Design a protein around this ligand. Structure first.
Ligand SMILES: [Ca+2]
Ligand SMILES: [Ca+2]
Ligand SMILES: [Ca+2]
Ligand SMILES: [Ca+2]
Ligand SMILES: [Ca+2]
Ligand SMILES: [Ca+2]
Lengths: 78, 102, 51, 51, 48, 51, 78, 51, 78
């Protein structure tokens, strides 16, 4: 049944907000992220950041961020 | 290409810098439409003050003056952007041609 | 892509521009806006798609 | 200089009087006066739609 | 025009839309190809 | 909307009443850390979606 | 006279625009652009743009557009 | 407040009614050169002081 | 009553604002800035401007003037 978050009553009987489900952190005890959302596994036209976030490879150093963690301006080269 | 001002330097001589290093603002940056002698002509967004500034090493000071440069509009409708189609009415605009004498 | 006549652009006086606003929507509750523009994004001159 | 033309106001007419259905997004200065001995002129910075 | 429901259809996907938003067009005074149009602000917006 | 590179430093803009928008019935400058979650609508970033 | 542009009447008797008097884009057959305005070209120290409105070559390619047509910053020129 | 370095380019913000205020009895945009030197309080830029 | 600067009376009977007490512009014929007040020219690694203001060792040329006279960004040393 719908409850506190109006989200999904997860398998262990916890009203978990689906806003966190597709985040990589198992919010419920079982399930949640186990019902894995689309990790696209991008080709090398994209670089991959510390979060595994894909971004256009020509922006691996340019002085302005593209990933949430900013790894596309990492001192590993820039 | 250049402007001139009295330097703070204690030998009191005129120094020059390129005009592309001048800027004018009120709220956001203005557009320097034209300049001639000790007069700068610019179009500025509305605001409560006018500011002139330099961006040239040591010469990066600036000056502001309190002035109610509120938005104004010719005609009878408080349009924000000049309308593309409509009536043409008599309006007065500063002639960007610096030869013109006010 | 294509071009259009904007009520205002770089030098104020209404002028033609390769980048022109066609419609603007702001129905998002987060206040973000979606712009339709005369230029095309994510496509190359050849028309191949590229982010 | 260009100045806009506010949408022509639909006019509703009735016994010895008119109702103007103004429709303008920007503040528009409507004015009116009688052609009698007394002008009785009025002015209002109308906004949006109003009657 | 300008009242609620100034545009209507039995459903959003239907092609039988009907409306009366007082759409009117003026002469293109400026050289640049245009189609000057004036109308009531959407009655749905005024009702909102 | 304006590009700032090479000869194509052109701009373009139209009059849009993009007022501050909020959802729920409490004004805010930014969504708060938390306290309540309510159904709202936003333009999603997944360019694959079609409106 | 003071008709469509509240400006001038050309030799065909039509209402024609003094705002559209001096600009590459010409108008009615006579009573128009032919008695040109100040279209004098600057000295050779000024760069000439595609509209023919000259601007100082002390600027030209500098990352800040100086002509109305933007010619001064083109990679075809820089 | 933002770290514009580009290396860890990020920003933080909080709501605050940071409204211009003025000691004395007349509104001013900037401290005018001439008038009474009325008693006022300001943060000493000398970082060695302690609040 | 309080003097016009609301502050100390100098030796000639004039009174002076503390804003001028240590400015180095002796407002009175005897006293004012002539009376001892502390100045120290920072660490020997740091630079110093025309008015005796210091600037940090890494900012002696950087594009942003840290002295209000501009001395830490003059073409005379940059
Ligand atoms: Ca999760
Ligand atoms: Ca980057
Ligand atoms: Ca012409
Ligand atoms: Ca340039
Ligand atoms: Ca003193
Ligand atoms: Ca410095």
């Amino acid at each position: 049944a719908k409850c506190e978050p109006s989200q999904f009553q997860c398998t262990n009987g916890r009203c978990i907000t689906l806003l966190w489900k597709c985040d990589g952190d198992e919010d419920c005890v079982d399930g949640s992220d186990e019902k894995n959302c689309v990790k696209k596994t991008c080709a090398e036209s994209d670089f991959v950041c510390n979060n595994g976030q894909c971004v256009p490879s020509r922006w691996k150093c340019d002085g302005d961020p593209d990933c949430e963690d900013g790894s596309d301006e990492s001192p590993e080269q820039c | 290409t250049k402007f001139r001002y009295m330097s703070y330097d204690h030998d009191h001589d005129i120094k020059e810098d390129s005009v592309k290093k001048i800027a004018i603002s009120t709220s956001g940056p203005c557009r320097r439409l034209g300049h001639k002698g000790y007069f700068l002509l610019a179009q500025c967004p509305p605001g409560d003050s006018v500011t002139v500034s330099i961006t040239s090493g040591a010469s990066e000071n600036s000056c502001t003056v309190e002035k109610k440069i509120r938005r104004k509009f010719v005609g009878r409708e408080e349009y924000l952007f000049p309308p593309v189609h409509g009536k043409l009415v008599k309006c007065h605009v500063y002639d960007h041609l610096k030869e013109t004498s006010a | 892509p294509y071009l259009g006549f904007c009520p205002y652009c770089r030098h104020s006086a209404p002028c033609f521009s390769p980048i022109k606003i066609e419609n603007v929507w702001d129905e998002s509750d987060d206040g973000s806006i979606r712009i339709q523009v005369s230029a095309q994004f994510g496509y190359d001159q050849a028309g191949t798609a590229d982010v | 200089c260009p100045v806009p033309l506010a949408h022509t106001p639909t006019v509703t007419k009735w016994f010895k009087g008119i109702t103007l259905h103004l429709t303008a997004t920007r503040p528009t200065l409507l004015t009116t006066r009688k052609l009698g001995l007394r002008a009785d002129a009025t002015a209002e910075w109308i906004t949006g739609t109003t009657s | 025009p300008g009242a609620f429901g100034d545009i209507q259809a039995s459903s959003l996907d239907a092609t039988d839309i009907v409306a009366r938003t007082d759409i009117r067009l003026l002469k293109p005074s400026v050289k640049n190809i245009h189609v000057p149009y004036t109308q009531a602000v959407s009655g749905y917006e005024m009702w909102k």
